C-alpha cells in the first residue's frame, strides 16, 4: 500500500499534533525529500504568530537575538477538522495542513491575508561550517498581482516596491539589511535568521559568459573586447572572458602595466541568450560608468569613489538566439577601481511574483507573521516583537553639523561659535575619527597637540547649549593596551592580525575588530569608553563600521573569514547582526551607569531590533551625486518600513568628486565660481532641502567643508535657502518632537512612504521620490541639476495646500509643479493640525509659550502636542504632558483638549493663535498670520471657526 497507509493523554508521538500552553506542533504526514518534518504555530499576541519548521524530529529552539519576551498571555482556540488544524485568536486565524505542513493566515472573518506556496513552500538543505550544523532554508508564499512590498532595510539601487524584485541581504558600507517586509495587504513577515539571506531569486547572479554567448568588437565568439586608453601612453586592446573586477582578488585580472587613474576603458561587443524573457542585470562600479544595451542608455552615468563602490540594477526582455549590442564606458578615477556586470536568467513571472525568502544557515526555520488594521499597526507588531523605540532626546531632533574631520579643538569650537554668531540654529556638533595620536587607534586618548584640553572643549560646547557626539569604531591597533585586553580573553577576530593587514593611515598599521557577539567583550568595549570618553561629558556615540567593516572591497568568503568565529557560532550563521550586538553594548552600558540619562547612538549598519537601543542608522559613505541623492529617498523609506524610525544621511554626500574639491580651492584663492562649484552649491542646496524633512537633520562629508557659510556666502541663494530650512526645522519643533513622542507611545514612524497613509490609492505604490514627514507634510525633493519644476502625484484626499502660499490643490492627480532653486515642493494634507513655535537657536532655548496652531480645513483631523523634560527617561514613569486636539470639518469646530499629565518645567499657562487655511482662504505660512487668540491653562476649550 501507500506510504500513508503503512505509516486524550497518550504520548504525543502517537498523535498528528500536540497542543501546549502557547503552541501547536504538527507532524507532517506526507514527508518529502528536503521538506519539513515538524511545523509549529506559536501564539505571541492577538495579531502575532511565530511559525517554526524543521527537517529534524525535534526543534533546536535557539534563543532569538531579535525577539524580546512579550507582555501578556494570549487566549486562543485550536480546532482540528480533518487535514486542517486552525489556531484562532480574537484577531487572526492561522491554519496548517497536516499532510504538507503548508500554512495560511486569515482575519477573524476568514478573509485571506497571506497563503504559503500551494502544496508547501519550505525546503531544507543541510549545511556544515567549522563543525557546526544547520540548514539552508527556502520559504515561499503566494502573492497576488496587486500586492506591494516595502522594507528589507536600506539598499542603494533605488528600488521601490519589491513586488517581483530581488535583493541580497548582507551588510556593507551604505547597505543595511533587515529581514523584515511589510505588505500593502496589511501584514509583515520577520525572518529570524542572522546569515546571508535573499528576497526573491534564491540564486547568485551569473558572470556573462555563463549565460550568454559573447562576441567581441570584431564579431569573434568567446569574449567581449576591452579597450584601455591610459592618461599617458599607448592604448591596449584585449579580449575579456567576463566583466568582473569587483574585489581585491579580481582587480588583479585587469591589465598589469596600465595605470587606471585618468584612463578611459570601453567594454564592448554583442551578447546572445539561449532563452527568451526578462534578464535581470547587476552593475558593480566605482569611478564614472555608463551602460548601453541594445543601443539604449540602460545605465546613465553614475559615480563612486574608487574605494566605496556601489551596485545598480536594470532589466531587459531579450529573445533567444538574437545578438544584441552591449557597451560599458568606464573612467576608473583611481589607481584602484571596480567594474562588473552579471545577470540572472529569466524567471517565469508566476514564480518571480511570489514572496520568496532564502537563508544560508540557521538551526531551523523561524518567522513571525504580524497582521494589522493598517501599515502603522503592522509596525506596532514589529515593535511588540523586537522592542519599542525610545523617544530620542529632544536635542537629536535639531540640526547636526559634522565634518570628516575637525582636526583640532579650535576648529570644532570655531564651527559651533560660527552658528551662534550668525543666528543659524543648531543643537549638535560631531567629532570624527583620528582625534587620537596617529599610532593609537582604539586607545581612546586625544592627540594633545591638536586637542590640548578635551574636557574644556566639551564644557565649551555645553556652555554654547550644544551637544557633542564622538566617533568610536570596533577597531583597535595591535599595539594598544585595549586591543591586548580583548586579545588575551579571546575576544578579537584573528584573521586580520594573522594576515598582517595594514590600514590606510600614515605608513599603515596592524589592527583587529572585537567580537560584539560575546557578552563579556561587549562589557569591556563599553567599559573602555566609560573610562576614557564618558568623564569628558560626551552626549552621543557615533558607532562607525559596525558591519563589521574589517577590510574594504573583499569577497564574501574572505569577509566571513574576517568576522568569525563568533561567540555564538560561525560567521556564516552569525553574519548580519553585529550592529545590533554593538548597540546593546552601549545602550545597556550607559543606562547601567546612569539609568535616567537618554542614550543616543548613530551607527553605520543595522538589523531587526536596532530601535530598542535608542540607535539610528545613517546611510554611510555615499557620493556627492544627484543619483545618490535620489537613491536616499527610496533607501530611507524602505528603512522606515523596516520598523526603525530614526535614520539619517550625509547631506551633500560623503565622498567628493575631484572637480568639486578643485572648485572650492579656486573659491578660497580667488572668490570666483567655476562651473563645477556652481553645481556644488546647487547640489548642497537641494540636499539640505530634502534633509530638513528626514528623521535626523545632519550635514557631513569629506572636504569641502560643509557649514553653510563655507558653501556660499550670506545673501547668495544657496545660503538663503539653507538658512530658511534650518530655521523652519526649529519653527516646526513642536510638531517634530510630537512625532518623536509618538515613536514610543504610538509605535509611530516619522519618514513615511505614501503607501502608509494612502494605501487605498494604488497609484502611490511605486512612488519612492515623494514622502510624508509625519501625518501632515508631503515632501517632493528636486534631484536633478538645473530643474526648476518637477512632476508630483497628489494622493486621493479631500485636498492639499501649498505650504508657502496656502493655495489649494486637488487630490488624485499628477502635474508639473514649480520648484525654484530656493524651494522644495511642500504640501499640507487637508485636516492637518500643525503647531509651530517661535524662532529659537537650539531645542528648548525658550519655552514654547506662543504656538501658532495651523488648521488646514476641508477634512477631519487630530493631533496631540507632546512635551516632556527632553533629556532624561522620566516619561517612562509618567512624567510628560499631552494636549490632544481634534478638528471636525462638518461643523468647523476645533477642540483643544484637557491636558493629560505634567512634568518638571512644564508650561502651566500658554498661548495659542489658531490660524485657518481653506479653499477660499490661501493663507501663506506666516508666524504673524491673523488668527484667534486662546489663553490656555490645561482646561479644554472649543472654537467654532
Ligand atoms: Ni583604558
3-state secondary structure 841-906: CCCCCCCCCEEEEEEECCCCEEEEEEECCCCECHHHHCCCEEEEEEEECCCCEEEECCCECCCCCC
CA of 518 to the centre of ligand 1 (A): 19
CB 354 within 8 Å of CB 141: yes
Domain spans of the chain? 8-204+347-387, 205-346, 388-750, 751-829, 830-945
Domain 830-945 has CATH 2.40.50.140: no
How far apart CA 499 and CA 509 sit, in angstroms, is: 13
Q: Render the burial of 638-659: b for 16+ CB within 10 Å, e for the rest.
A: bbbbbbbbbbbbbbbbbbbbee
CA of 448 to the centre of ligand 1 (A): 17
CA of 446 to the centre of ligand 1 (A): 12
CA of 481 to the centre of ligand 1 (A): 7
Q: CA 140, 141, 144 angle in degrees (round to 5)?
A: 135
How far apart CA 173 and CA 604 sit, in angstroms, is: 7
- Name the CATH code of domain 205-346 (choices 2.30.110.10, 2.60.120.380, 3.40.190.10, 3.20.20.60): 2.60.120.380
How far apart CA 644 and CA 392 sit, in angstroms, is: 12
Q: Which superfamily does CATH assign the domain made up of 8-204+347-387 to?
A: glycosyl hydrolase (family 31) (2.60.40.1760)
How far apart CA 299 and CA 324 sit, in angstroms, is: 16
Structure-solving method? X-ray
Show the cell assigned to 17. 499534533
Q: Where are the alpha helices (DSSP H) in 159-263?
A: 208-211
Show the cell assigned to 724. 530658511
Domain 388-750 has CATH 3.20.20.80: yes
CA of 443 to the centre of ligand 1 (A): 7
CB 86 within 8 Å of CB 78: yes
Q: CA 777, 783, 787 angle in degrees (round to 5)?
A: 105
E strands, 705-746, are none
Integer CA distances (angstroms), 157 to 312, 313, 394, 682, 760, in order: 5, 6, 33, 23, 27
CB 682 within 8 Å of CB 785: yes
Find residue 834's DSSP bridge partners: 854
CA of 596 to the centre of ligand 1 (A): 25
Q: For the domain covering 751-829, report its CATH number.
A: 2.60.40.1180
CA of 453 to the centre of ligand 1 (A): 18
CB 929 within 8 Å of CB 912: no
CB 207 within 8 Å of CB 271: no
CA of 521 to the centre of ligand 1 (A): 14
Count of alpha carbons within 13 angstroms of residue 314, beta-carbon side: 14
CA of 767 to the centre of ligand 1 (A): 50
Q: Which residue has the cell 572585537?
A: 514
Q: Give the pairing of strands 540-543 and 467-472.
A: parallel
Longest dimension (CA), the chain: 93
CA of 527 to the centre of ligand 1 (A): 8
749 CB-contact burial (10 Å; exposed 0-12 / middle 13-18 / buried 19+): buried
Other Cβ atoms closer than 10 A to 578: 28
Q: List the one residue out of 481, 504, 483 whose CA is nearest residue 434.
A: 504
Integer CA distances (angstroms), 927 to 113, 332, 735, 839, 854, in order: 47, 51, 15, 10, 10
Q: Give the pairing of strands 826-829 and 800-802.
A: antiparallel
Other Cβ atoms closer than 10 A to 845: 14
536 CB-contact burial (10 Å; exposed 0-12 / middle 13-18 / buried 19+): middle
Fold equal for 205-346 and 388-750: no
How far apart CA 191 and CA 358 sit, in angstroms, is: 10
Q: Give the pairing of strands 910-917 and 850-856.
A: parallel
Element (H, E) at 736: helix 733-745
How far apart CA 350 and CA 355 sit, in angstroms, is: 11
Phi first, then psi, for residue 375 (nearest 5°) are -65, -35
Give the active site residues: 544, 547, 621
CA of 559 to the centre of ligand 1 (A): 29
Spell out the residues 6+ positions from residue 11 whose beta carbon is closer than 8 angstroms to its own.
none
What's the start-to-end Cα distance of the chain, in Å? 81
Q: Give the pairing of strands 264-273 and 212-215.
A: antiparallel
Other Cβ atoms closer than 10 A to 147: 19
CA of 520 to the centre of ligand 1 (A): 16
How far apart CA 119 and CA 30 sit, in angstroms, is: 11
CA of 582 to the centre of ligand 1 (A): 18
Instruction: Tell me, in Å, the resolution of the deposited structure.
Output: 1.5
CA of 530 to the centre of ligand 1 (A): 9
Q: Where are the alpha helices (DSSP H) in 465-577?
A: 481-488, 495-498, 519-532, 556-562
How far apart CA 399 and CA 842 sit, in angstroms, is: 8
Sheet-wide strand order for 197-199: 122-129, 132-141, 355-362, 197-199, 167-169
Amino acid at each position: 500500500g501507500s506510504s500513508h497507509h503503512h505509516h486524550f493523554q497518550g504520548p504525543a508521538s502517537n498523535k498528528v499534533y500536540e497542543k501546549t500552553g502557547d503552541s501547536v506542533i504538527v507532524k507532517v504526514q506526507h514527508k518529502e525529500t528536503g521538506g519539513p518534518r515538524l511545523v509549529r504555530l506559536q501564539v505571541m499576541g492577538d495579531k502575532l504568530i511565530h511559525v517554526s519548521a524543521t527537517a529534524d524530529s525535534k526543534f533546536a529552539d535557539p534563543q532569538s537575538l531579535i525577539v524580546v519576551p512579550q507582555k501578556k498571555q494570549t487566549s486562543f482556540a485550536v480546532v482540528q477538522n480533518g487535514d486542517t488544524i486552525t489556531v484562532s485568536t480574537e484577531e487572526v486565524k492561522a491554519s496548517v495542513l497536516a499532510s504538507t505542513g503548508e500554512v495560511w493566515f486569515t482575519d477573524k472573518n476568514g478573509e485571506l491575508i497571506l497563503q504559503e506556496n500551494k502544496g508547501g513552500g519550505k525546503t531544507f538543505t543541510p549545511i556544515e561550517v567549522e563543525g557546526t550544523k544547520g540548514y539552508t532554508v527556502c520559504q515561499v508564499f503566494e502573492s497576488p498581482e496587486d500586492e506591494a512590498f516595502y522594507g528589507l532595510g536600506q539598499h542603494q539601487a533605488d528600488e521601490f516596491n519589491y513586488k517581483g524584485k530581488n535583493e541580497e541581504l548582507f551588510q556593507y558600507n551604505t547597505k543595511v539589511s533587515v529581514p523584515f517586509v511589510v505588505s500593502n495587504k496589511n501584514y509583515g513577515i520577520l525572518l529570524d535568521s542572522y546569515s546571508f539571506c535573499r528576497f526573491g531569486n534564491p540564486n547568485d547572479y551569473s558572470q556573462l559568459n555563463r549565460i550568454f554567448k559573447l562576441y567581441d568588437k570584431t564579431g569573434q565568439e568567446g569574449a567581449l573586447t576591452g579597450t584601455y586608453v591610459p592618461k599617458k601612453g599607448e592604448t591596449l586592446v584585449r579580449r575579456e572572458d567576463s566583466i568582473y573586477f569587483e574585489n581585491l582578488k579580481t582587480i588583479e585580472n585587469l591589465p598589469k602595466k596600465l595605470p587606471l587613474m585618468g584612463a578611459k576603458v570601453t567594454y564592448e561587443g554583442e551578447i546572445e541568450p539561449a532563452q527568451t524573457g526578462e534578464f535581470k542585470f547587476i552593475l558593480y562600479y566605482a569611478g564614472y560608468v555608463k551602460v548601453y544595451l541594445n543601443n539604449e542608455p540602460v545605465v546613465p552615468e553614475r559615480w563612486r569613489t574608487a574605494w566605496n563602490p556601489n551596485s545598480y540594477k536594470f532589466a531587459a526582455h531579450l529573445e533567444a538566439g538574437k545578438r544584441v549590442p552591449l557597451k560599458i564606458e568606464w573612467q576608473p578615477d583611481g589607481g584602484q577601481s571596480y567594474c562588473g556586470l552579471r545577470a540572472l536568467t529569466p524567471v517565469n513571472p508566476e514564480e518571480q511574483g511570489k514572496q520568496s525568502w532564502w537563508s544560508e544557515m540557521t538551526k531551523q526555520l523561524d518567522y513571525y507573521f504580524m497582521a494589522g488594521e493598517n501599515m502603522d499597526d503592522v509596525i506596532s507588531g514589529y515593535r511588540s516583537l523586537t522592542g519599542k523605540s525610545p523617544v530620542m532626546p529632544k536635542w537629536a531632533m535639531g540640526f547636526w553639523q559634522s565634518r570628516e574631520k575637525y582636526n583640532t579643538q579650535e576648529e570644532m569650537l570655531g564651527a559651533l561659535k560660527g552658528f551662534r554668531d550668525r543666528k543659524i540654529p543648531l543643537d549638535n556638533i560631531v567629532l570624527d575619527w583620528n582625534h587620537w595620536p596617529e599610532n593609537a587607534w582604539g586607545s581612546h586618548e586625544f592627540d594633545k597637540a591638536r586637542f590640548p584640553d578635551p574636557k574644556a572643549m566639551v564644557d565649551s560646547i555645553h556652555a554654547m547649549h550644544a551637544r557633542m557626539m564622538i566617533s568610536v569604531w570596533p577597531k583597535f591597533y595591535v599595539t594598544t593596551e585595549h586591543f591586548k585586553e580583548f586579545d588575551e580573553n579571546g575576544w578579537m577576530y584573528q584573521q586580520s592580525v594573522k594576515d598582517s593587514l595594514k590600514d590606510w593611515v600614515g605608513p599603515g598599521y596592524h589592527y583587529g575588530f572585537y567580537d560584539a557577539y560575546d557578552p563579556d567583550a561587549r562589557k569591556l568595549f563599553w567599559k573602555q569608553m566609560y573610562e576614557h570618553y564618558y568623564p569628558l561629558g560626551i552626549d552621543a556615540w557615533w558607532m562607525d563600521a559596525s558591519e563589521p567593516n574589517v577590510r574594504d572591497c573583499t569577497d564574501l568568503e574572505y569577509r566571513k573569514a574576517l568576522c568569525g568565529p563568533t561567540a555564538l557560532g560561525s560567521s556564516t550563521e552569525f553574519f548580519n547582526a553585529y550592529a545590533l550586538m554593538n548597540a546593546e553594548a552601549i545602550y545597556d552600558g550607559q543606562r547601567g551607569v546612569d539609568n535616567n540619562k537618554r542614550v543616543f547612538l548613530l551607527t553605520r549598519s543595522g538589523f531587526a531590533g536596532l530601535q530598542r537601543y535608542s540607535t539610528a542608522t545613517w546611510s554611510g559613505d555615499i557620493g556627492t551625486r544627484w543619483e545618490d541623492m535620489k537613491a536616499q529617498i527610496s533607501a530611507g523609506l524602505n528603512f522606515a518600513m523596516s520598523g526603525i524610525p530614526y535614520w539619517t544621511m550625509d547631506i551633500g554626500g560623503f565622498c567628493v568628486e575631484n572637480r568639486y574639491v578643485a572648485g572650492q580651492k579656486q573659491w578660497n584663492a580667488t572668490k570666483t565660481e567655476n562651473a563645477d562649484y556652481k553645481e556644488w552649491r546647487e547640489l548642497n542646496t537641494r540636499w539640505y532641502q530634502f534633509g530638513a524633512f528626514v528623521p535626523l537633520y545632519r550635514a557631513h562629508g569629506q572636504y569641502p567643508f560643509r557649514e553653510i557659510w563655507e558653501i556660499a556666502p550670506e545673501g547668495h541663494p544657496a545660503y538663503q535657502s539653507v538658512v530658511y530650512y534650518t530655521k523652519l526645522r526649529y519653527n516646526m519643533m513642536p510638531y517634530i518632537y510630537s512625532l518623536a513622542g509618538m515613536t514610543w507611545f504610538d509605535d509611530y514612524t516619522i519618514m513615511r512612504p505614501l503607501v502608509m497613509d494612502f494605501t487605498a490609492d494604488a497609484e502611490v505604490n511605486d512612488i519612492g521620490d515623494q514622502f510624508m514627514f509625519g501625518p501632515s507634510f508631503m515632501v517632493s525633493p528636486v534631484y536633478r541639476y538645473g530643474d526648476r519644476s518637477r512632476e508630483i502625484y497628489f494622493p486621493q484626499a479631500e485636498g492639499w495646500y501649498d505650504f508657502y502660499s496656502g493655495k489649494f490643490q486637488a487630490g488624485g492627480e499628477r502635474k508639473v509643479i514649480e520648484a525654484p532653486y530656493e524651494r522644495i515642493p511642500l504640501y499640507v494634507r487637508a485636516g492637518a493640525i500643525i503647531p509651530f513655535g517661535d524662532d529659537i537657536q537650539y531645542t528648548d532655548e525658550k519655552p514654547a509659550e506662543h504656538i501658532r496652531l495651523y488648521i488646514y480645513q476641508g477634512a477631519d483631523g487630530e493631533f496631540t502636542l507632546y512635551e516632556d523634560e527632553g533629556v532624561n527617561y522620566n516619561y517612562e514613569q509618567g512624567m510628560y504632558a499631552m494636549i490632544p486636539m481634534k478638528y471636525d470639518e462638518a461643523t468647523k469646530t476645533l477642540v483643544i483638549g484637557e491636558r493629560q499629565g505634567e512634568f518638571p518645567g512644564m508650561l502651566k499657562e500658554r498661548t495659542f493663535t489658531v490660524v485657518t487655511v481653506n479653499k477660499e482662504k490661501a493663507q501663506p505660512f506666516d508666524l504673524n498670520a491673523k488668527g484667534v487668540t486662546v489663553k490656555y491653562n490645561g482646561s479644554e476649550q472649543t472654537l467654532k471657526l
